[PDB]
Design a protein around this nucleic acid. Sequence first.
RNA 1: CAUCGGUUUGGAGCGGCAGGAUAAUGGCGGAGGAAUGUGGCACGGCUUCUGCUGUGUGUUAUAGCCUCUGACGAUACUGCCA
RNA 2: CGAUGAUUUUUGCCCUGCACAUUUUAGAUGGAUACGAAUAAGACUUUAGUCGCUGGACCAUAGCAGGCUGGCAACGGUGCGCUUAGCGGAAAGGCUUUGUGCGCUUGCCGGCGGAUAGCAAUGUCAACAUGCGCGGGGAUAAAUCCUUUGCAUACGACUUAG
Lengths: 130, 199, 106, 190, 170, 291
Amino acid sequence: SSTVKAANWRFVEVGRVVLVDNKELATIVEIIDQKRVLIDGPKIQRQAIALAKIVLTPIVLPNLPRGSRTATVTKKWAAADIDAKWAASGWAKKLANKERRSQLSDFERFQVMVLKKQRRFATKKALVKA
Amino acid sequence: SSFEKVVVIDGKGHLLGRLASIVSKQILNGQKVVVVRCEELNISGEFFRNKLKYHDYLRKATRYNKKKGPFHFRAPSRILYKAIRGMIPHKTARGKAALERLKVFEGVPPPYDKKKRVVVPQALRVLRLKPGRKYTTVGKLSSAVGWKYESVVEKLEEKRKVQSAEYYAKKKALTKKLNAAKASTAESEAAQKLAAFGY
Amino acid sequence: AESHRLYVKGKHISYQRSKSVTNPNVSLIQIEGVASPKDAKFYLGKRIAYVYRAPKEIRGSKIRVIWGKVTRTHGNNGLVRANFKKNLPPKTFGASVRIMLYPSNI
Amino acid sequence: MKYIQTDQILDIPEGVTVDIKARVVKVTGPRGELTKDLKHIDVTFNKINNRAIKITVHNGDRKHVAALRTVKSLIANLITGVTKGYKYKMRFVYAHFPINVNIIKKDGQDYVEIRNFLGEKRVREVKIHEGVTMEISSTQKDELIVSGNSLEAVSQNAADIQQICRVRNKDIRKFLDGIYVSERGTIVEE
Amino acid sequence: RLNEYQVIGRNLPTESVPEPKLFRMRIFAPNTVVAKSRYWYFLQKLHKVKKASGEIVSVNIISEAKPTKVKTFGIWLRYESRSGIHNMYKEYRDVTRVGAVETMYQDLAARHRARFRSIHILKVVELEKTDDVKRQYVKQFLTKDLKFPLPHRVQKSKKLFQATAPTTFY
Amino acid sequence: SHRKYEAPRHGSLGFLPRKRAAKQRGRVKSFPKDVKSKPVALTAFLGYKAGMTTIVRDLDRPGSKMHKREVVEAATVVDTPPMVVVGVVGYVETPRGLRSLTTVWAEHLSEEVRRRFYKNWYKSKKKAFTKYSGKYATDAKQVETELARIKKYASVVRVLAHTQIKKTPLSQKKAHLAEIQINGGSVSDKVDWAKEHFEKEVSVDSVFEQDEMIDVIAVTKGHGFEGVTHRWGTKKLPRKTHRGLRKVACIGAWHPANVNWTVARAGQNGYHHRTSINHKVYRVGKGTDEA
RNA sequence: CAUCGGUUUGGAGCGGCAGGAUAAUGGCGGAGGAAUGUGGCACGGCUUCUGCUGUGUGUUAUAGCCUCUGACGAUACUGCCA
RNA sequence: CGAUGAUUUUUGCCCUGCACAUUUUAGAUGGAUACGAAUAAGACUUUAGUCGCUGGACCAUAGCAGGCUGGCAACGGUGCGCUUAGCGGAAAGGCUUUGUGCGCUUGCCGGCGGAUAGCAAUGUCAACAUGCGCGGGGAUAAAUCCUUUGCAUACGACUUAG
Ligand SMILES: NC[C@@H]1O[C@H](O[C@H]2[C@@H](O)[C@H](O[C@@H]3[C@@H](O)[C@H](N)C[C@H](N)[C@H]3O[C@H]3O[C@H](CO)[C@@H](O)[C@H](O)[C@H]3N)O[C@@H]2CO)[C@H](N)[C@@H](O)[C@@H]1O
Ligand SMILES: [Mg+2]
Ligand SMILES: [Mg+2]
Ligand SMILES: [Mg+2]
Ligand SMILES: [Mg+2]
Ligand SMILES: [Mg+2]
Ligand SMILES: [Mg+2]
Ligand SMILES: [Mg+2]
Ligand SMILES: [Mg+2]
Ligand SMILES: [Mg+2]
Ligand SMILES: [Mg+2]
Ligand SMILES: [Mg+2]
Ligand SMILES: [Mg+2]
Ligand SMILES: [Mg+2]
Ligand SMILES: [Mg+2]
Ligand SMILES: [Mg+2]
Ligand SMILES: [Mg+2]
Ligand SMILES: [Mg+2]
Ligand SMILES: [Mg+2]
Ligand SMILES: [Mg+2]
Ligand SMILES: [Mg+2]
Ligand SMILES: [Mg+2]
Ligand SMILES: [Mg+2]
Ligand SMILES: [Mg+2]
Ligand SMILES: [Mg+2]
Ligand SMILES: [Mg+2]
Ligand SMILES: [Mg+2]
Ligand SMILES: [Mg+2]
Ligand SMILES: [Mg+2]
Ligand SMILES: [Mg+2]
Ligand SMILES: [Mg+2]
Ligand SMILES: [Mg+2]
Ligand SMILES: [Mg+2]
Ligand SMILES: [Mg+2]
Ligand SMILES: [Mg+2]
Ligand SMILES: [Mg+2]
Ligand SMILES: [Mg+2]
Ligand SMILES: [Mg+2]
Ligand SMILES: [Mg+2]
Ligand SMILES: [Mg+2]
Ligand SMILES: [Mg+2]
Ligand SMILES: [Mg+2]
Ligand SMILES: [Mg+2]
């Protein structure tokens, strides 16, 4: 055999899902340059953006033709169910938990501390015998 | 952005002047800084150019008495110190106090061999230079200009890394055991409540 | 309670100044954890105390305080301008100040 | 111009197993193994199959594209070094003074000992690189055979032998004496 | 930051000539004050008219027809160097006709040190056919199934110090 | 304008400053580089300059006009009674240079070496090294612990030895104590050799053989304050020069408006530390030999 | 501390109105066209056709795109809000 | 800058435990939270899954600046004091560890206390240094002037001897 280690990059291709502004999802519909792409999405405005302003996700929207219009992008996004695919990843889960933590109140933080005390007691009890 | 009692920076892979300016402004603002592994610092530009630059620096000396002139320090830590001091009003009492807030070393001597070293992304060579550019390691320039203890430092750094590797293997084993204990106490009332809170 | 702090950590950085002339009547303060004028705008109007130690006792206490207040933001990285009852002495450059949470508007 | 993508295709013969991980190429063949580190170049590798490897440069400028086919050629030279070997033949050129060449061993090291070069009392010694074999040709008078798997070491040892026999303070157009590389081929004839 | 303007003007009517011909120009200007200034600059380069003897008739913004359709534009230029006057032709990929001109102005500033005052835009044409594309540096983006990664990603940090090793995966 | 003629400089800039040595005992700045494969042996010895003499020797130098022919040569006699080993020092390789880790001493020190640590011996209670001598109490485990530390951590091992100056005709009673680097063998071998040689005499015949080439470290003859003419070998000024002639006429150009460090000036001459190399050993004599 | 008055710096500020190609887009409907030709089909190299793939063909099929257009509905930008 | 010898029969010196009072502080106010290496690559958990896309993390965090008492569940956690063993010389002066004793435990539940500092005023709580009282262990010097020397020297200084 050969056993060549290949790069696991994310590629700039028609159908790549990207995060914009740490809030919204979008997909690449056509490549402008090494630096610029045309993006579209159900909850975003179809626009030409610089690749520095977006982050490629490991997700590809399969079978998206180059230059697809807003209707095609929305229809294929609904078919591929990109929102559910995103929401199941540890990245989106970490973002959601960060938001949830940011919405806690002082009383909820106090309760968090109390629950941490109880769980640490249980964890030490489990750890000493295992 | 937090204020730390001491910030210990691992100097490996850092560009000399960007780290120097950042550390100067940090110590001027009352922050204590320790820089370790100054022999692993980086300067942009090929090695020969920096050797020529250091020889231009060496050219400069007080004519009537060489003992009064610039003192060309050959150690990597002293090169970083010169870079920083050029960025400080060192002839005032305030600059003197700011410089007292700073320490620079070759290698990682005690007690810092068992403490946390951080990096400075705004000054990292691997993140700043274009991927084709050539760079210099300050340890090789120092040996090339008179620093005598390169092989002593590399012998002691290999010894430190052997001990530091044993540390990590112990920490990974105890981290694995605690995770198995945290897995047992999962799906408990505290864990379910902590999951609704985001923890 | 291992912690008892009721103030935000700050640092006395500088006076308001040009290249060569300094203005002691305005101090530049770095609030800990603040990195933008939007974050720093939460702290506008909050009173500031500089707490220091002195040789002579006053009413049995050797601790004296100079009080101030936040007036405006400064620049783009979350520094603020402060106005103290008595100007902060220049030797306090790099010394820590206390950013009080009052007058509170939460 | 920042060419968007440039590719080269390595071809791996049947008995050869290239092996690449983090720009460290280890080529294995019937004749042995050779290794080379490429951390000074920005290239990426894709295994098309067991007989072909794609070597790619993405968004590379003129010089960075130029550094791609040299990577291809170096790995190909490794492959033919581990499947056919390398052989350089040197001819001894002298007008009057015979060149006395011996293969000696001092201090546990192999050396090529050149004596009487242009009548000099000086004894020239060239260290023989590891993995390089020297032989005094029997079928040919005044011939040295330098052989080995690595083309770089063999050609550099040959160059060492050639460089140590330079003529000083004379018209080198007339005084053509020296030891020169006459043939650059392979151990296995083709 | 530019806009495309339609500026129409004419000579002031005389009793000899009461309806002078109306001339339109397409001007890429940041605002209408520079748009009407550039108009008179080129008419006095072509026609016997002045701002004192003329009249601006209309200024209207020309919006992109399909601002979210990726196009390739060919721009014909006439620029002044330190030594002479030269004609050049270049090609740009962008979604707006204006955005190709903004790249063009940045581009001739960077490779030829040509300032805005030294440049005349003769023509901007959208290349409908892929055979209309003459330049390689934009033709290389018209290949089928174009994919490429972005190796060596550098992440901008909000904090001065980071407690974990830097990475460039992407 | 330039000098009318180009002459070489007066004196060497590699022996500045021409000041007095900090100590009268010359100190070995650098020792021979250590080779593990050699046997454990000393690299230095201390002696006293007795005087000069003359020898006659048949020369063995092919191609010389004096080959196999008698030559008359000046020679120097160095009185070298055996030295006594009293201590050992360990040195550790550090990123700041060699650093002394520990010094271990012998149980008994002779009076001549205990006088080394005193300026007024006759007025003293002579308390030096008495508690340390007590450190050897019935098990001497403190000494063994320090020696094990030296074996474990030291990279350079040097012995401490003193001359037996009471065997010389000098009226001085203070011995001269110096560190002599130990070369050969492992660190453990050096430490065992040093410990086993405590309170023992070591002779010159165990350090130097005949026909060897050795170096000499010493402080030269003092001459006190000297003028430039003899201190630096400068040209005497003409006989008819006002205010004297044993001077340097021009001590600098107008600019730099300072006196340069390279100009010859009057000052203290001699009593300098010098290292002189490649002196051949014609004879290692023995005091017990009647010939 | 509260409230006021004068001056002033702001907010991820909120709302109403007007203008423009009575924005241009986009979405929906209809008509036409091409290729960086989708499905299909025909030859191949590796696949027990395991996003197989290359090339040819051709015009919506098991993707789509471009142009024109018909009736609505928005938004950007900019002004004004006593 | 290091190693090492000796350190005032003085009410003087060293080490140490407590206790107190002072001067100083370039500026405590939960925690300086320890692999290495690469980056056209990496981690983890077994070449395949997961991870990153920042520390908005992790640990710690409840109790008159944290009081007085009582009870369960567990046999854990932690502070301090002896104590066991091992490792660390790059500036180790720290990192572990055995047994034991005295506390606390907020893992959970009870009973009692805080007011008046009056609507804020740092509303005083830390470590470095020095001195002083006790208690305990411990040791009991030199250098200079002077005379002398001449390996030295203008005088200081230097090599000697007393
Ligand atoms: N699943 C829908 C698919 O639509 C595709 O076909 C699409 C195109 O061929 C067709 O072309 C354009 C379209 O791009 C554009 N966005 C709208 C325009 N009205 C369409 O035009 C065409 O389709 C419409 C019906 O939609 C017809 O009324 C009209 O006559 C025809 N020229 O619009 C169709 C629908 O968007 C597939 N080729 C077809 O096999 C399939 O039905
Ligand atoms: Mg620790
Ligand atoms: Mg030097
Ligand atoms: Mg204080
Ligand atoms: Mg010549
Ligand atoms: Mg000639
Ligand atoms: Mg690192
Ligand atoms: Mg002259
Ligand atoms: Mg030396
Ligand atoms: Mg010690
Ligand atoms: Mg010690
Ligand atoms: Mg004299
Ligand atoms: Mg004399
Ligand atoms: Mg004289
Ligand atoms: Mg005269
Ligand atoms: Mg006079
Ligand atoms: Mg008002
Ligand atoms: Mg007001
Ligand atoms: Mg409107
Ligand atoms: Mg429309
Ligand atoms: Mg068409
Ligand atoms: Mg097809
Ligand atoms: Mg409309
Ligand atoms: Mg409308
Ligand atoms: Mg508006
Ligand atoms: Mg208004
Ligand atoms: Mg006090
Ligand atoms: Mg990593
Ligand atoms: Mg994991
Ligand atoms: Mg693994
Ligand atoms: Mg594995
Ligand atoms: Mg994997
Ligand atoms: Mg963490
Ligand atoms: Mg932790
Ligand atoms: Mg209790
Ligand atoms: Mg218990
Ligand atoms: Mg100590
Ligand atoms: Mg110590
Ligand atoms: Mg600890
Ligand atoms: Mg107050
Ligand atoms: Mg108190
Ligand atoms: Mg208290
Ligand atoms: Mg004297």
